[PDB]
């Protein structure tokens, strides 16, 4: 369960 806020290459907002 990677942290979405840490990810800068993928949109955190769900579809």
């Amino acid at each position, epitope marked *: 369960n*990677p*942290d979405p*806020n*840490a*990810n*800068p*290459n*993928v*949109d*955190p*907002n769900a579809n």
Partner: antibody, heavy 122, light 109 residues
Framework: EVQLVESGGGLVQPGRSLRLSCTAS????????MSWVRQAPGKGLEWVGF??????????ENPASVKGRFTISRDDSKSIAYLQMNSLKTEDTAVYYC?????????????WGQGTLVTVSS | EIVLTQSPGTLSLSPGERATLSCRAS???????LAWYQQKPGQAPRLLIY???SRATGIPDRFSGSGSGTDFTLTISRLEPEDFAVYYC?????????FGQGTKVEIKR
């Protein structure tokens, strides 16, 4: 060749504001996340925020130490990344590096600018 | 917040020796989200290795990395004179992003 040039640093009194600029060249700016890292004199590296590419929402993320005080934006028209710094205190004195976030599964800081010095003193 | 503790603070070696730099994390992080940087005095940091087994472009083969979960290692197989500098580990799989306090590799006399 990937190039990152920081500008807009220098001396500023406590409480005032200052905006740092990062002009990019040698790559497609709009496709990459950009991130700011600062280094206090004689100390280590501290991440002070990144901004995603507009194809990934274009939103930002900031640490608690500068949250509500620092603001990161981008201008894909001119390939410039900005660091808006408000309510500067003496602890914000540091060399501020502009970095490009690498694409893919492992988003490391692949390229760094030479850095610009910001001194917060009265 | 995940804290990266680097050890030792200062590595006193000589050219030709092997350099083993450690970086321990307060929480278990994936190797894909761990990177190592090199900084010489007065110069910007540069990326060396990142992820499970990725090397930055133009980085010599003597730099390598390994580790799983909580203990990671940056290894310089045979130290060159240009390798004496400060090395920071970084995690970016957990917000906020954090760096280690840095390990200095100095010339032994």
């Amino acid at each position: 060749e990937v190039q990152l040039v920081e500008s807009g640093g220098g001396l500023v009194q406590p409480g005032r504001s200052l905006r740092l600029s990062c002009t990019a060249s040698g790559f497609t700016f709009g496709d990459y996340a950009m991130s700011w890292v600062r280094q206090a004199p004689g100390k280590g590296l501290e991440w002070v925020g990144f901004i995603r590419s507009k194809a990934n929402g274009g939103r930002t993320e900031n640490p608690a130490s500068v949250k509500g005080r620092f603001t990161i934006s981008r201008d894909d028209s001119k390939s410039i990344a900005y660091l808006q710094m408000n309510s500067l205190k003496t602890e914000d004195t540091a060399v501020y590096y502009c970095t490009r976030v690498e694409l893919g599964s492992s988003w490391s800081l692949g390229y760094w600018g030479q850095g610009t010095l910001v001194t917060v003193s009265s | 917040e995940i804290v990266l503790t680097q050890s030792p603070g200062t590595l006193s070696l000589s050219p030709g020796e092997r350099a083993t730099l450690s970086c321990r994390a307060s929480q278990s992080v994936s190797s894909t989200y761990l990177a190592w940087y090199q900084q010489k005095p007065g110069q910007a940091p540069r990326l060396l290795i990142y992820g499970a087994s990725s090397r930055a472009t133009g980085i010599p083969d003597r730099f390598s990395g390994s580790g799983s979960g909580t203990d990671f290692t940056l290894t310089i197989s045979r130290l060159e004179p240009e390798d004496f500098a400060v090395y920071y580990c970084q995690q970016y799989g957990s917000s906020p992003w954090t760096f280690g306090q840095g390990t200095k590799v100095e010339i032994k006399r």
